[PDB]
Design a protein around this ligand. Structure first.
Ligand SMILES: CO[C@H]1O[C@H](CO)[C@@H](O)[C@H](O[C@H]2O[C@H](C)[C@H](O)C[C@H]2O)[C@@H]1O[C@H]1O[C@H](CO)[C@H](O)[C@H](O)[C@H]1O
Lengths: 117, 112
């Protein structure tokens, strides 16, 4: 049942803006948080932010706040992350994960790779 | 904000109990930090293991348990199996951020 399906690979140029998405299926979208995790080889993992589709509440990592916008569309059970001002530091694999009270990711999407070049 | 620290690498044998720890640079990990543990398998395969310090995620084997031991959050694997060979990441909720440890690579000896 539970599926978090992410959009595909993105190649973009420095200074551009990209929007990535995660479609959730197999659970009620408005009873869970959707978190976004960045994995950069070597660097390990970094949390970007989270949105609760039930009332649109968001938490952002202070590092990413200006450059990230998180949204969700409940009719399509899809969450979006828009990143702007891309630099080479943004090249990484991005994951959507399902969270709730006390946890950020019981189910993880497959990862979407972003290369800025 | 805080720095979260884990052992870089541990080796165990099949059938042994192994414990992995997770520390906060503030000196102690509390229940309010909701310590989370996830497993990374080859090919970017991530499985959520433990949330809110000791709650096993859906479908996780009973040999995995989480708790607070002393000043640290801990993941204990009672009776390690070869399939437990993986990287384990701890994350703590601190000042409204999830902050990740660097991961512990666990080596296990031997061969809808
Ligand atoms: C509205 O969301 C806050 O409150 C609910 C109900 O208590 C918590 O479940 C929320 O915490 C979860 O979601 C965030 C994004 C993290 O993944 C941690 C999860 O437990 C969230 O709690 C935060 O906000 C409240 C204020 O409302 C407090 O600051 C609390 O310390 C935070 O955890």
């Amino acid at each position: 049942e539970v599926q978090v399906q992410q959009s595909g690979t993105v190649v973009a140029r420095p200074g551009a803006s990209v929007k990535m998405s995660c479609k959730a299926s197999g659970y009620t979208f408005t009873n869970y948080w959707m978190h976004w995790i960045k994995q950069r080889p070597g660097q390990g993992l970094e949390w970007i932010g989270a949105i609760y589709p039930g009332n649109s509440a968001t938490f952002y990592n202070h590092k990413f706040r200006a450059k990230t916008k998180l949204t969700a569309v409940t009719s399509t059970t899809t969450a979006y992350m828009e990143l702007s001002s891309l630099t080479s530091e943004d090249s990484a694999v991005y994951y959507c994960t399902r969270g709730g009270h006390g946890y950020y990711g019981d189910y993880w999407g497959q990862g979407a790779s972003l290369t800025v070049s | 904000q805080i720095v979260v620290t884990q052992e870089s690498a541990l080796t165990t044998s099949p059938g042994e109990t192994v414990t992995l720890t997770c520390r906060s640079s503030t000196g102690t990990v509390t229940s309010g930090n909701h310590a989370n543990w996830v497993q990374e398998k080859p090919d970017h395969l991530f499985t959520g293991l433990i949330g809110d310090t000791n709650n096993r995620a859906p479908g996780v084997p009973a040999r995995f348990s989480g708790s607070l031991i002393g000043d640290k959050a801990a993941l204990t694997i009672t009776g390690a199996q070869p399939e437990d060979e993986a990287i384990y990441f701890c994350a703590l909720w601190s000042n409204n951020h999830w902050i990740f440890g660097g991961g512990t690579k666990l080596t296990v000896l031997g061969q809808g």
